[PDB]
């Protein structure tokens, strides 16, 4: 089950726009409106992707005022992404 | 391009058997024969998955005697996987 859950985590990340969303969130937590604005994605699209990411426990949301603010779920997720980005960058 | 490459990395990991292969390799570097034996996967299957993993630079291979020995590409990959496994395990 552990490895099946890990599989689900990686499957959730296997998408360019979701990676763009994750990366933006690694810079700062954000509302849907802000994510859409920053990434030139529609709010309906962003909401759909976040639902998917949230189901896979890679992003979380908290309520500020009456708005949901999204962030990477926790440090493990942040570390996974930062290490992956770095890995993609260095010479092979 | 960086984020497209990261996308390709995560897409490569989005599979249960490939995760099982990665996890085994995190324990110890291994030949195809050994991976197949340990995971109850066929050698032809294992070879196919490794080609895919290698193309995505998540595993590497070195020659010992006249056999190829596979390992996780490097520490970033190891860290990504270990942090993901841990994330999957802890309470949500
Ligand atoms: Cl869009
Ligand atoms: Cl098989
Ligand atoms: Zn922890
Ligand atoms: Zn690396
Ligand atoms: Zn490094
Ligand atoms: Zn975690």
Instruction: Give the Å distances, CA to CA, from A77 to A37, A42, A59, B30, B61.
Output: 23, 24, 8, 28, 27
Domains and CATH numbers, chain A: 1-92 (1.10.10.10)
Put simply, the answer to whether A77 touches B57 (Cβ < 8 Å) is no
Resolution (A): 2.0
Put simply, the answer to whether A9 touches B79 (Cβ < 8 Å) is no
Give the SS3 label for residue B59.
strand
Q: Searching chain A, which residue's CA lies closest to the CA of residue B10?
A: A14
B63 Cα to the center of ligand 6, angstroms:
36
A chain contacts of residue B19, beta-carbon cutoff 8 Å: 3, 6-7, 10
What is the DSSP-derived secondary structure letter of residue A38?
Answer: H
Q: What sign has the CA pseudo-torsion B61, B81, B16, A2?
A: positive
Interface contacts (A, B; CB < 8 Å):
94
Breaks in chain B after residues (C–N exceeding 2.5 Å):
none
B77 Cα to the center of ligand 6, angstroms:
17
Put simply, the answer to whether B10 touches A20 (Cβ < 8 Å) is no
Put simply, the answer to whether B5 touches A79 (Cβ < 8 Å) is no
Which experimental technique did the depositors report for determining this structure? Answer: X-ray
Nearest Cα neighbor of B10 from B47, B54, B58, B51 is: B58
Interface with chain A: mutation pick from B1, B2, B8, B10, highest number of A CBs within 10 Å: B10
Distance, CA of A16 to CA of A65 (rounded, Å): 31
Put simply, the answer to whether B80 touches A83 (Cβ < 8 Å) is yes
Cβ-in-10-Å burial (0-12, 13-18, 19+) of A9 comes to buried
Cβ-in-10-Å burial (0-12, 13-18, 19+) of B35 comes to buried
A46 Cα to the center of ligand 1, angstroms:
7
Q: Give residue A57's region: left, alpha or beta (phi > 0; psi -120 to 50).
A: left
Nearest Cα neighbor of B13 from B78, B87, B92, B90 is: B78
């Amino acid at each position: 089950d552990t490895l099946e859950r890990v599989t689900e985590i990686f499957k959730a990340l296997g998408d360019y726009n979701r990676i763009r969303i994750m990366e933006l969130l690694s810079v700062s937590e954000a509302s849907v409106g802000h994510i859409s604005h920053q990434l030139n994605l529609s709010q309906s699209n962003v909401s759909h992707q976040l639902k998917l990411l949230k189901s896979a426990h890679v992003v979380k949301a908290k309520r500020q005022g009456q708005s949901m603010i999204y962030s990477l779920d926790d440090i493990h997720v942040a570390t996974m992404l930062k290490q992956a980005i770095h890995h993609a960058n260095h010479p092979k």
